[PDB]
Amino acid sequence: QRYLWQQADGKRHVYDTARHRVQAGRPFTALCGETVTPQTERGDLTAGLWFDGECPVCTIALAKALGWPVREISDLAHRFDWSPALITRLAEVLHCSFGEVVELTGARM
Ligand SMILES: [Zn+2]
Numbered sequence: 001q002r003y004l005w006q007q008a009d010g011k012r013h014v015y016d017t018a019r020h021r022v023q024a025g026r027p028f029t030a031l032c033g034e035t036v037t038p039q040t041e042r043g044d045l046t047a048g049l050w051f052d053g054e055c056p057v058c059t060i061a062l063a064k065a066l067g068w069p070v071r072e073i074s075d076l077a078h079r080f081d082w083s084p085a086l087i088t089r090l091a092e093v094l095h096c097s098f099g100e101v102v103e104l105t106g107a108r109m
Pocket residue numbers: 012013014030031032033034055056057058059
């Protein structure tokens with residue numbers, strides 16, 4: 001498995017095992033491009049205690065990276081609430097326009 005989940009900075013992010021090794025107190029850069037530090041006191045190093053919500057940008061980015069059809073990624077995207085900052089970041093990660101992410105994610109408003 002090239003990609004694994006890892007809770008850090010209050011969300012379950014995904015990371016590329018070819019580029020990072022997870023260690024307590026050490027930063028890594030997740031698929032969403034956020035640099036995050038797992039901490040033992042937050043339960044980050046104990047998988048049975050991962051209670052944070054999933055990182056929406058990492059989730060969508062993982063599906064895209066596993067080669068999902070755009071319709072399926074869209075259904076997946078619809079189960080998150082997308083702030084404008086989340087749309088912008090996903091746009092940067094998918095390397096597409098803001099308008100295409102709005103369409104993909106069903107973000108209204
Ligand atoms: Zn993330």
